[PDB]
Design a protein around this ligand. Structure first.
Ligand SMILES: CNc1ccccc1C(=O)O[C@H]1[C@@H](O)[C@H](n2cnc3c(=O)[nH]c(N)nc32)O[C@@H]1COP(=O)(O)OP(=O)(O)NP(=O)(O)O
Ligand SMILES: [Zn+2]
Length: 323
RNA sequence: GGGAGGGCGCUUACCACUUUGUGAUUCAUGACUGGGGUGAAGUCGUAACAAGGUAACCGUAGGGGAACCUGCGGUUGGAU
């Protein structure tokens, strides 16, 4: 890996794209004309790419590609013309600059963008067995930081009841109070599937939830053809296409939105609400904890700031230094 | 006169082909699979080598979606 050699190399790969696009036959013979595509499936060593034509091609990925991931739309080739026609045979000559995308946190292994070109990131979730706002709280900051739109969807609502929902919806009202988008539904039950469908209308976004939040239900509910197995018990990079438009990078991980450490002054910018809680405090450097005359504290224990949000926000900062 | 004798002849014995059984051996066919070979992922995890960050390892039990867990016995192939 060579930042320098990597650099000079970058320019080369870039030119290769524009140069190849200039026009074809000089390129030719083994492979066919270049075309655009996005990465639906990751074969570790291969990738399924959907072409402009709309037909997916499993392709090789020339070493010259530092990396690739799902949600990556860009130029591509298959082998020849003839070669795609017997058996999905294609190769990815180069990629495009991911306009909108996000990565996963990790521990040893470094942050890796999960998907690119995202208009909205709908946080799944599920009532079974029990939610944890924390997971959603940390996710809220991510959506703000990548400047992506967030949709929280309390799913599997059909599983709740009298003393079950009256505590679910309300408890989630927080999102409806601070201006967030949410739509209670139950894949098993197909309820509130109208609102979501419209929300996903003309947009490029995807859904990720925590361990077992009904991600397979919703993705399989909106549009499911010859493939409805991704439920079933409690268990587990392909970005599937939508029934009403939009795609959703599903890989068995993403739904488990962890939490990575970006900066120590950003955490305060995570929530817009803080725009009024970070005005005047007791200590110029008051981390908002046990200071005398704080602002965020005087608001929390005052009824305006949701206590639950305080504990979660404070825990997030203590989670980073966990390294 | 003929006669012995022989052939023709039938039949007997051995038995070739081959049908009933009875199976034995392989070729294939295929409902169905263990578990192998690969790596430019996600996780969900911190597993082995440090005291590696549930000493390790061995037998075997029960247990557990995932590496693993654990009872039981054993050891020195475990930092101080
Ligand atoms: O059992 C299955 C479901 O039957 C059930 N399930 C899904 N939707 C619903 C629902 O609406 N209601 C109920 N009761 N169960 C549901 O919830 C479980 C999870 O469904 P999955 O589709 O696999 O969820 P992910 O795809 O998000 N998971 P990963 O990110 O790891 O791929
Ligand atoms: Zn303060």
């Amino acid at each position: 890996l060579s930042k320098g050699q990597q650099r000079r190399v970058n320019a080369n790969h870039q030119r290769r794209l524009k140069t190849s696009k200039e026009k074809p036959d000089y390129d030719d013979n083994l492979f066919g004309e270049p075309d655009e595509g996005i990465v639906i499936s990751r074969f570790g060593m291969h990738a399924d790419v959907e072409s402009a034509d709309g037909d997916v091609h499993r392709c090789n990925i020339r070493r010259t590609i530092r990396s690739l991931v799902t949600g990556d739309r860009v130029v591509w080739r298959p082998g020849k013309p003839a070669a795609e026609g017997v058996n999905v045979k294609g190769i990815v000559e180069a990629v495009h600059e991911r306009t909108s995308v996000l990565t996963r946190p990790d521990f040893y292994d470094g942050v890796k963008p999960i998907a690119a070109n995202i208009d909205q990131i709908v946080i799944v979730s599920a009532i079974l067995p029990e939610l944890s706002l924390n997971i959603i709280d940390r996710y809220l900051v991510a959506c703000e930081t990548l400047q992506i739109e967030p949709i929280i969807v309390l799913n599997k609502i059909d599983l709740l009841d009298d003393e079950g929902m009256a505590f679910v919806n309300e408890q989630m009202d927080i999102y409806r109070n601070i201006g967030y988008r949410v739509l209670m539904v139950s894949s098993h039950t197909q309820d509130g599937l109208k609102p979501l469908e419209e929300a996903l209308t003309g947009r490029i976004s995807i859904f990720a939830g925590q361990s077992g939040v009904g991600k397979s239900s919703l993705l399989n509910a909106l549009l499911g053809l010859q493939k409805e197995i991704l439920t079933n018990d409690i268990s587990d990079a392909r970005l599937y296409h939508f029934p009403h438009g939009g795609d959703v990078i599903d890989s068995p991980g993403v739904r488990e939105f962890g939490l990575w450490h970006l900066e120590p002054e950003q955490i305060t910018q995570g929530f817009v609400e803080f725009h009024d809680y970070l005005g005047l405090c007791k200590y110029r450097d008051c981390k908002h904890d046990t200071d005398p005359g704080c602002a965020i504290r005087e608001a929390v224990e005052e009824g305006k700031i949701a206590e639950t949000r305080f504990e979660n926000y404070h825990r997030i900062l203590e989670s980073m230094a966990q390294v």
